[PDB]
Short mmCIF file of C-alpha atoms in Angstrom, two decimals:
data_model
loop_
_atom_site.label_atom_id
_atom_site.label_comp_id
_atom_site.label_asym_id
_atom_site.label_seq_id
_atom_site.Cartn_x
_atom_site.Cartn_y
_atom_site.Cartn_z
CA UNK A 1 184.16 105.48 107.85
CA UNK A 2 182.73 101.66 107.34
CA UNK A 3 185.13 99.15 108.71
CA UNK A 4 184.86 95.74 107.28
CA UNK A 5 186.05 91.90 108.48
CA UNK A 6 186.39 88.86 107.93
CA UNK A 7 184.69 86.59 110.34
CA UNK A 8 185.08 82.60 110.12
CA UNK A 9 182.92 80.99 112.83
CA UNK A 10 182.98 76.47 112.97
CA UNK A 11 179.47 76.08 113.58
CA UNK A 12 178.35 74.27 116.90
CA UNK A 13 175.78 72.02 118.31
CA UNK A 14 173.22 74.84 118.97
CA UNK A 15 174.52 76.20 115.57
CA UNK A 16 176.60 79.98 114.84
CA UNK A 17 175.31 81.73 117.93
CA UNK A 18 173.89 85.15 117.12
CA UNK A 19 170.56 86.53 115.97
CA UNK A 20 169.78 87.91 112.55
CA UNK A 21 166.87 90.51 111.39
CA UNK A 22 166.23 92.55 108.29
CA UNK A 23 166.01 91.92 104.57
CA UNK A 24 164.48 92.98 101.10
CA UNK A 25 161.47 92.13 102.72
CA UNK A 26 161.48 93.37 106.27
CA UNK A 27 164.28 96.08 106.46
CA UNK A 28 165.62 96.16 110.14
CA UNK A 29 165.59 100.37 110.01
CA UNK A 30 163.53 100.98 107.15
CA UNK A 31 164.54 101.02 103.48
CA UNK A 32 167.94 99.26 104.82
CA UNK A 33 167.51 95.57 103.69
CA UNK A 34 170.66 94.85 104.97
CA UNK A 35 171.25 91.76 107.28
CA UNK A 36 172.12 93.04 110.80
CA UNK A 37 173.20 91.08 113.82
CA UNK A 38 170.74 91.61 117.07
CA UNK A 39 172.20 89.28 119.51
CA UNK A 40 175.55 87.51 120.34
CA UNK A 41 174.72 84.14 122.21
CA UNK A 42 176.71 83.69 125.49
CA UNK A 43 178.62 80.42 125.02
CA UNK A 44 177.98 80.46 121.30
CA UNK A 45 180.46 80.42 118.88
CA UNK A 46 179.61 83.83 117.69
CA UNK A 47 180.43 84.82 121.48
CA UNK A 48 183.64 82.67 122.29
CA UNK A 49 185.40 84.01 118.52
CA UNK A 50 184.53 87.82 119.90
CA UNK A 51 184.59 89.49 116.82
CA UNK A 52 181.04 89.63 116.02
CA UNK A 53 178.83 92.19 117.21
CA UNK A 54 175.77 93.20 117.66
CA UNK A 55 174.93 96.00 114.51
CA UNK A 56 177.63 94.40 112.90
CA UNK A 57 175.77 93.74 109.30
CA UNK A 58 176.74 90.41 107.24
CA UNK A 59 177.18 91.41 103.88
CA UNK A 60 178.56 88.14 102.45
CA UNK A 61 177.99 84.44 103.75
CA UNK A 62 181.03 82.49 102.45
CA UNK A 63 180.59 83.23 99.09
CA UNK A 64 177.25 84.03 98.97
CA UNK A 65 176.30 87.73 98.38
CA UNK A 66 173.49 88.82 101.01
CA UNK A 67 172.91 92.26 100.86
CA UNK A 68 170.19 92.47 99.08
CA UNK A 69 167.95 89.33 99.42
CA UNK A 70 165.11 87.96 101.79
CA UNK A 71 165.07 87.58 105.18
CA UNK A 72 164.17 83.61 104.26
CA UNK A 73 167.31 83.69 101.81
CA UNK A 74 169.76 85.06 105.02
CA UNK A 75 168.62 81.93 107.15
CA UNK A 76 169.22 79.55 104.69
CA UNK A 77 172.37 81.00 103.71
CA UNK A 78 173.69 80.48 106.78
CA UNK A 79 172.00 77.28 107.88
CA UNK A 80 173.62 76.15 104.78
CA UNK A 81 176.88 77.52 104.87
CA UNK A 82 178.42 74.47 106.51
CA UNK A 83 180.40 73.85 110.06
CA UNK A 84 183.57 76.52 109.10
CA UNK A 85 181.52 79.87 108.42
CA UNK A 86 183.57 83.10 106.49
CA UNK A 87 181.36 86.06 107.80
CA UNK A 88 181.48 89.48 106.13
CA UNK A 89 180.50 92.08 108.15
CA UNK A 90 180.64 95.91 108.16
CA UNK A 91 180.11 97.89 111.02
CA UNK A 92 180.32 101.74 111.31
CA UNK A 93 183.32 104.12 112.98
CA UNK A 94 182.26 107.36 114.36
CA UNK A 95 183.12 110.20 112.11
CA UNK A 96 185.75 113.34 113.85
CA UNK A 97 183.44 115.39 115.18
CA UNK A 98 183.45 119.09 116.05
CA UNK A 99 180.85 120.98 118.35
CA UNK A 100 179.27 124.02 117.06
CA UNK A 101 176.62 126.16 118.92
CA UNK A 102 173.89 127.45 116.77
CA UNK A 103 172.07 130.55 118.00
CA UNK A 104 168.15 130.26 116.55
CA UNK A 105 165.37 133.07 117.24
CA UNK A 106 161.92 131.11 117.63
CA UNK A 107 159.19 132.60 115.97
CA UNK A 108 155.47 131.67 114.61
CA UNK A 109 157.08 129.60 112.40
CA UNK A 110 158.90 127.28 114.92
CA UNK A 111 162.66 126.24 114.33
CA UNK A 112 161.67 124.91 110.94
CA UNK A 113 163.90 121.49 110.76
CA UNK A 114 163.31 117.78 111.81
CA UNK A 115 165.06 115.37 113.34
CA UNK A 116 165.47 111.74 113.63
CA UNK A 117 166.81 109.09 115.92
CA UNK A 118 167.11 108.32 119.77
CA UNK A 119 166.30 105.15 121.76
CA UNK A 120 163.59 103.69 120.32
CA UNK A 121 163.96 104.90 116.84
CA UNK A 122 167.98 105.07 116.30
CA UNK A 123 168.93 106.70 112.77
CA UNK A 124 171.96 104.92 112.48
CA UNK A 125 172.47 100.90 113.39
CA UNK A 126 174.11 101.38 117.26
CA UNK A 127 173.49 104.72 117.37
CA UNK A 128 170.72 106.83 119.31
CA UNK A 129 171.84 110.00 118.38
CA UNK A 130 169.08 112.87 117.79
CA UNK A 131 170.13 114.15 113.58
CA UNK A 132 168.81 116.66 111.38
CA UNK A 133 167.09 115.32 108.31
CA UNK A 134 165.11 118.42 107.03
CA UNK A 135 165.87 121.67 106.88
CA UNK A 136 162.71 123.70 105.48
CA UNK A 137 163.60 126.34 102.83
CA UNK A 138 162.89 130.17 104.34
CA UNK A 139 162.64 128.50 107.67
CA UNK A 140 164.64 129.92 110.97
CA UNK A 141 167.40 127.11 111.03
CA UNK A 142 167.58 127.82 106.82
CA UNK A 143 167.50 131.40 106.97
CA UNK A 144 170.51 131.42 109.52
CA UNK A 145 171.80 128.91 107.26
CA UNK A 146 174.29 126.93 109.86
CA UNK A 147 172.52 124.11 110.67
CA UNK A 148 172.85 121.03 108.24
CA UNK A 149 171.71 117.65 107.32
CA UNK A 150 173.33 115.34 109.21
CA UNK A 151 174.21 117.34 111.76
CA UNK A 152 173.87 115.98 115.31
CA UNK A 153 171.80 118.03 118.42
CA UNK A 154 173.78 117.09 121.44
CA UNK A 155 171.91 119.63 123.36
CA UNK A 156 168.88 122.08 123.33
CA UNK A 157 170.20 125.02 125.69
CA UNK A 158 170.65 123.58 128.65
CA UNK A 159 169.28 120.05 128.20
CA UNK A 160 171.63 117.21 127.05
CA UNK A 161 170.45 114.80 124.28
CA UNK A 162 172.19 111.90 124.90
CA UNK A 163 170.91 108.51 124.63
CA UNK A 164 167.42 109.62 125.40
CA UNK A 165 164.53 108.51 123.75
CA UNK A 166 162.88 110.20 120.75
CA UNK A 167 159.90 111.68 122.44
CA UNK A 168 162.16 113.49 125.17
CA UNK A 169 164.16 114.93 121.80
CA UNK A 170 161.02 116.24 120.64
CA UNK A 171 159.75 117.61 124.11
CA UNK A 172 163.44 119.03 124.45
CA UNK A 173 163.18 121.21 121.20
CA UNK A 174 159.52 122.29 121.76
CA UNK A 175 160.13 123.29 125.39
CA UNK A 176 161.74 126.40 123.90
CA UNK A 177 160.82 130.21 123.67
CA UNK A 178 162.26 133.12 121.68
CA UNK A 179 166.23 132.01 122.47
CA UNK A 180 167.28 128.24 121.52
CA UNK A 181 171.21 127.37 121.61
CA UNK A 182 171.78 124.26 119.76
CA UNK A 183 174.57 122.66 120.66
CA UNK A 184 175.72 120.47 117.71
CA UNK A 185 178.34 117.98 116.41
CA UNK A 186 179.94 118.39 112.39
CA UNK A 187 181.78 115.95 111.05
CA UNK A 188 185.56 117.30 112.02
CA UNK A 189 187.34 116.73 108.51
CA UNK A 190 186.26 119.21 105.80
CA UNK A 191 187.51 120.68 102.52
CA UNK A 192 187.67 124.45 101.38
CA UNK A 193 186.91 125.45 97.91
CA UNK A 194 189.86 128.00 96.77
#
């Protein structure tokens, strides 16, 4: 569900008018050496064109290739690129979705799954969304055997996980005895094996 454009920018006195981090060297959300845009400049040229945006990850600078490369090598790519700019950016749509409620009995052994994401620690570029990234073998979540990678926890019974931070996540799924109801978002589209 990427979604890619062309973005051609004529640089300006106070230069392009956004914000870069990440690289080889310093990946903006670990791993990810991708270059990703922070900030959008009011009055830049980044800002006045409106098609940039912040997440928005340059994969290509004219015809340079810059997704894999040094923070260093992203500046100077662009500070080099000259006054009419061709950015290549790809930015993420939001998969269908369907909402499932899980049913989990809590025992010694906890839930047995992790998670990942929420503000100040998003998973996904944008996104704060709390996601499964482990689900222990013989554990309660495996056992049942509903719960999946990449699933999303909207909710822990009655409390919502929505843009909250990562520690209120946690606290949200350890505040929980004996009954949990997960409320949780699949990807909609799927395919049957016949």
């Amino acid at each position: 569900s990427m979604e890619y454009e062309e973005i051609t920018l004529e640089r300006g006195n106070s230069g392009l008018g956004f914000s870069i981090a990440g690289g080889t060297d310093n990946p903006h959300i670990g791993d990810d050496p991708s270059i990703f845009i922070t900030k959008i400049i009011p009055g830049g040229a980044a800002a006045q064109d409106g098609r940039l945006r912040v997440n928005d990850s340059i994969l290509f600078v004219n015809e340079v290739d810059v997704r894999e490369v040094t923070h260093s090598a992203a500046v100077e790519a662009l500070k080099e690129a000259g006054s009419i700019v061709r950015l290549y950016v790809m930015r993420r749509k939001p998969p269908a979705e369907k909402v499932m409620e899980i049913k989990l009995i809590k025992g010694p052994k906890g839930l047995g799954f992790s998670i990942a994401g929420g503000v100040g620690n998003q998973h996904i570029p944008g996104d704060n969304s709390i996601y499964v990234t482990k689900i222990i073998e013989g554990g309660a979540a495996h056992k049942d055997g509903r719960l999946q990678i990449g699933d999303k926890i909207l909710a822990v019974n009655s409390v919502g996980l929505e843009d909250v931070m990562h520690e209120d996540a946690v606290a949200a799924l350890k505040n929980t005895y004996d009954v949990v109801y997960l409320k949780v978002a699949k990807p909609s589209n799927a395919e049957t094996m016949a």
